[PDB]
């Protein structure tokens, strides 16, 4: 359990005093829960962490109850940004961040859009930030925005793949963190400009 806090994701904007409906379970956007994701929905998840079986736009997607297209942060293109995750129950696993470089609030984000910009960690270590220790609190991740990419209505997607289930690793082996895991996604509305 945790949420993208800086910039604030859609279901957490109430915490900062925005006029968006509150979600007191904003730490629980776990794709409808593990069994719903993996037993009901074939491993699929909404773009923004909702149960995949809900119709689009889902509650945390643009046009859903929490998706009012209110920009919560403005960044310079190509800059290093520092994002904060509030981790309430610190399940082992890793985080990834994707940018849908959308320019119109009336079109809907898709995973294909997000997948065009998988964000690199500023430290050069790749695309996955690993939370190695079970410690609740605020985790900061420094990310490099892609050079030359600007967007007036961007969506930032945080993905958390937990690692607390044992499964077939596919190499003849099984292991902790192999196979399907509980997953979280959160979306935040941001803008990126040359400035
Ligand atoms: Cu949790």
Author numbering: 1 to 195
Provide excerpts from the study.
Here, we report the investigation into the digestive enzymes from T. domestica, which we show include members of an uncharacterized family of endogenous LPMOs. Phylogenetic analysis reveals that this family is widespread across Phyla not previously known to possess LPMOs, including algae, oomycetes, and complex animals, and is active on both cellulose and chitin. The high statistical significance of the new HMM, and the lack of significant hits against HMMs of previously characterized LPMO families, allow us to rigorously define a new family, which will appear as AA15 in the CAZy database. Our in depth phylogenetic, structural, and biochemical characterization strongly suggest that AA15 LPMOs are a key part of this ancestral mechanism and help explain why T. domestica is one of the most efficient cellulose degraders in the animal world.
The coding sequence representing one of the most abundant T. domestica LPMOs (contig GASN01405718.1, henceforth termed TdAA15A) was cloned and expressed in Escherichia coli with a C-terminal strep-tag. Samples were analyzed by MALDI-TOF MS and peak masses of the reaction products compared to previously published data, revealing a predominant C1-oxidation pattern and generation of C1-aldonic acids on both substrates in presence of an external electron donor. MALDI-TOF MS analysis of crude extract from activity assays carried out with Cu-loaded TdAA15A in the presence of 10 mM EDTA failed to detect the release of both native and oxidized oligosaccharides, indicating that the apo-enzyme is not active and that copper is essential for activity. We determined the crystal structure of TdAA15A to 1.1 Å resolution, revealing the typical central β-sandwich fold of LPMOs, decorated with diverse loops and stabilized by five disulfide bonds. The Dali server was used to compare the fold more widely with other structures in the Protein Data Bank (PDB)19 revealing that TdAA15A most closely resembles bacterial AA10 LPMOs with the best structural match being the Serratia marcescens AA10, CBP212, 20. The TdAA15A active site is also characterized by the ubiquitous LPMO histidine brace. His1 and His91 directly coordinate the essential copper cofactor with a T-shaped geometry as observed for all copper bound LPMOs characterized to date. While having most of the canonical features found in other LMPOs, the AA15 structure reveals an unusual β-tongue-like protrusion which links strands 8 and 9 and forms part of the surface surrounding the active site.
